[PDB]
Amino acid sequence: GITGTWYNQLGSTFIVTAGADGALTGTYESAVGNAESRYVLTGRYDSAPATDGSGTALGWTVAFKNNYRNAHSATTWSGQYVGGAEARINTQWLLTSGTTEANAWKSTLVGHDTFTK
Amino acid sequence: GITGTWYNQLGSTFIVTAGADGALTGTYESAVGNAESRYVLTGRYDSAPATDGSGTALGWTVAFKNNYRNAHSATTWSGQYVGGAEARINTQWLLTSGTTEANAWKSTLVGHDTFTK
Amino acid sequence: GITGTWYNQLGSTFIVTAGADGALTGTYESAVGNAESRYVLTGRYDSAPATDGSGTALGWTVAFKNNYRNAHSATTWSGQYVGGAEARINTQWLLTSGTTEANAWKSTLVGHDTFTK
Amino acid sequence: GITGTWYNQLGSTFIVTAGADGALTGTYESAVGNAESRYVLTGRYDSAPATDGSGTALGWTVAFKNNYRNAHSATTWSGQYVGGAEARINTQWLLTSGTTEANAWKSTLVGHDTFTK
Ligand SMILES: O=C(O)CCCC[C@@H]1SC[C@@H]2NC(=O)N[C@@H]21
Ligand SMILES: O=C(O)CCCC[C@@H]1SC[C@@H]2NC(=O)N[C@@H]21
Ligand SMILES: O=C(O)CCCC[C@@H]1SC[C@@H]2NC(=O)N[C@@H]21
Ligand SMILES: O=C(O)CCCC[C@H]1SC[C@@H]2NC(=O)N[C@@H]21
Numbered sequence: 001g002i003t004g005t006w007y008n009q010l011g012s013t014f015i016v017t018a019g020a021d022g023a024l025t026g027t028y029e030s031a032v033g034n035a036e037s038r039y040v041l042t043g044r045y046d047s048a049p050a051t052d053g054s055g056t057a058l059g060w061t062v063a064f065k066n067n068y069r070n071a072h073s074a075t076t077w078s079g080q081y082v083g084g085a086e087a088r089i090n091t092q093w094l095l096t097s098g099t100t101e102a103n104a105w106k107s108t109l110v111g112h113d114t115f116t117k
Numbered sequence: 118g119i120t121g122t123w124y125n126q127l128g129s130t131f132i133v134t135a136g137a138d139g140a141l142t143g144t145y146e147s148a149v150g151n152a153e154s155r156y157v158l159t160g161r162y163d164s165a166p167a168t169d170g171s172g173t174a175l176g177w178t179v180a181f182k183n184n185y186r187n188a189h190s191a192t193t194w195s196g197q198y199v200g201g202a203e204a205r206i207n208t209q210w211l212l213t214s215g216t217t218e219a220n221a222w223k224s225t226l227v228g229h230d231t232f233t234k
Numbered sequence: 235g236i237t238g239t240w241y242n243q244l245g246s247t248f249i250v251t252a253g254a255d256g257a258l259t260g261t262y263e264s265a266v267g268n269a270e271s272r273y274v275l276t277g278r279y280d281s282a283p284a285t286d287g288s289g290t291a292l293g294w295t296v297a298f299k300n301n302y303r304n305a306h307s308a309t310t311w312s313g314q315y316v317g318g319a320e321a322r323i324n325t326q327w328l329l330t331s332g333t334t335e336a337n338a339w340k341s342t343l344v345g346h347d348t349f350t351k
Numbered sequence: 352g353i354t355g356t357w358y359n360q361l362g363s364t365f366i367v368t369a370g371a372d373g374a375l376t377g378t379y380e381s382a383v384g385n386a387e388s389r390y391v392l393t394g395r396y397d398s399a400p401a402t403d404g405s406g407t408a409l410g411w412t413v414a415f416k417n418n419y420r421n422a423h424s425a426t427t428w429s430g431q432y433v434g435g436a437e438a439r440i441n442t443q444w445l446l447t448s449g450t451t452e453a454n455a456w457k458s459t460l461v462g463h464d465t466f467t468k
Contacts, residue, residue, distance in 0.1 A: 010456060022180050023159065032456060040139065042159045043193075044180035046215060050189050054215040059193040061176035063139050063161035072163055076176035076193035078211035078225060082218070092225055092344060094195035094209050094461070098163065098171040101199065105361060105383060107172075108195060108209055110227075110326060110445070110461040112346045127339060149339055209461060211344070222244060222266055227328070227344040227443060229463045256391070256414050276374070276393045278414035280449060284423050288449040291425040293412035297373055297395035306397050310410035310427035312445035312459065316452070326445055326459055328429035332397060332405035341431065342443055 002045060002058065002081050006089060006115040014041075014089075014115055016060070022047040028062045034071040035064055045081070055080035058089070073097040077113065089115040119162060119175070119198050123206060123232035131158075131206075131232055133177075139164040145179045151188040152181055162198070172197035175206070189215040194230060206232035235317050236279060236292070240349040248275075248323075248349060250294070256281040262296045268305040269298055279315070289314035292323070306332040311347065323349035352434045353396060353409070357466040365392075365466055367411075373398035379413045385422040386415055396432070406431035409440070424448040428464065440466040 002018040015038075016026035024043035029035075043060025059078045064071040079091030095109040119135040133143035141160030146152075160177025176195045181188035196208030212226040236252040249272075250260030258277035263269075277294025293312045298305035313325030329343040353369040362382035367375060375394035380386075394411025410429040415422040430442030446460040 057191040059178040059191040074174040074176040076195040078193040100170040293425040293427040295410035308408040308410045310429040312427040
């Protein structure tokens with residue numbers, strides 16, 4: 001279900017593997033922003049969701065540093081996986097950049113991503 | 118540095134190790150909500166931040182499922198390590214609960230936690 | 235342009251008048267939550283947006299109290315208006331409920347609504 | 352108890368009057384950002400809050416355009432008034448800037464301000 005290759009609305013690619021333990025591991029490639037090639041991701045998901053048609057809560061983090069460049073930022077996605085013919089992962093994210101103390105009021109962007117297979 | 122035992126304004130406890138690879142691993146114990154005992158966390162951080170006075174960007178995730186309890190929820194903290202006169206982690210977070218499609222509009226809480234050692 | 239009747243993805247109805255002052259006034263009707271009938275809204279908008287084809291910044295508030303009921307809550311929508319053939323208002327919102335101090339950590343939901351005519 | 356002159360952690364100044372209907376009217380002056388002098392604000396508040404110790408839900412908007420400047424941006428504050436010894440208004444905010452479609456993913460900042468009398 002959650003494991004596989006997903007794409008959002010900006011065209012970024014989320015490649016993820018959901019493990020026994022509730023662990024998420026894989027790779028993120030952004031189509032936008034100060035980003036090039038793939039980045040490591042890690043996260044967690046609820047490995048025993050409610051049985052009432054509820055979705056599956058999950059979240060993951062990407063620090064946008066790889067061998068090619070470093071944006072000095074990290075993003076976390078919070079959302080849920082909804083399985084089925086039209087499987088989706090619906091999220092909201094927070095992108096925090098390293099700022100000085102004086103600019104910290106402006107260090108965090110908020111947005112929402114929708115991923116489909 | 119980031120490795121260590123941190124507490125937030127609620128009294129929750131964040132125990133982390135920062136790997137040289139940009140990995141964050143540890144446990145989280147919440148003082149509030151539908152939680153008891155400790156939860157695995159996993160995250161990422163900028164392992165080569167700027168030194169221009171800027172903080173260190175980081176994020177992590179906790180799914181609130183352990184051997185004791187399952188809240189069917191996942192929270193992500195996005196923020197930055199500030200190495201001022203005091204060690205501090207300022208974050209904003211997103212908590213998403215598993216919900217049916219009907220209730221998805223009301224699935225996600227947002228807040229802000231500050232951590233000191 | 236902004237002035238008109240708008241509907242979001244949940245089926246809520248936003249009727250507003252954009253004033254010369256940069257004032258937004260109207261009524262809001264939610265299809266979801268603890269709400270019946272129309273509610274008073276007020277907001278503001280950039281009455282002189284960039285000419286580069288950027289959208290128009292705006293926001294508005296609704297306290298969910300009227301003669302029918304009082305949810306002891308208030309939402310604020312923050313976003314931009316984009317004109318043309320398929321004019322749209324894309325927003326993110328914050329919904330804060332009155333709580334005790336002990337429960338302030340869970341007082342605020344976050345979401346996103348997209349409005350069309 | 353909401354009416355009056357408030358200051359936040361950044362040094363911004365917030366002058367409000369709460370109307371009986373449940374209106375919020377006033378001016379806002381920002382210590383930071385692409386801002387100078389006063390800005391009209393407007394908003395709503397729960398004029399009939401619970402009487403169990405809960406705060407009063409409120410919200411307000413500021414479009415950062417005035418005689419002096421236009422940032423092509425709007426901020427909304429959502430949160431609650433905690434009355435008593437140290438009157439507080441705890442908020443979270445969304446700041447949206449007019450952008451083109453291409454940059455829309457990065458148009459919104461999120462933050463939180465604490466105001467005191
Ligand atoms: O009630 C649940 O669903 C478990 C949530 C755990 C508590 C939340 S996570 C964000 C915030 N920071 C904390 O230390 N506790 C709350
Ligand atoms: O339940 C309440 O506290 C009052 C109803 C709030 C409904 C919310 S406001 C954000 C979202 N957009 C809508 O059109 N309805 C919901
Ligand atoms: O720079 C702009 O686009 C306009 C000024 C922005 C000031 C922001 S609004 C949120 C935060 N709280 C404040 O008191 N000031 C900043
Ligand atoms: O700081 C940067 O510019 C690098 C990261 C790129 C931004 C992101 S993360 C949220 C959004 N979703 C997505 O696929 N790309 C952008």
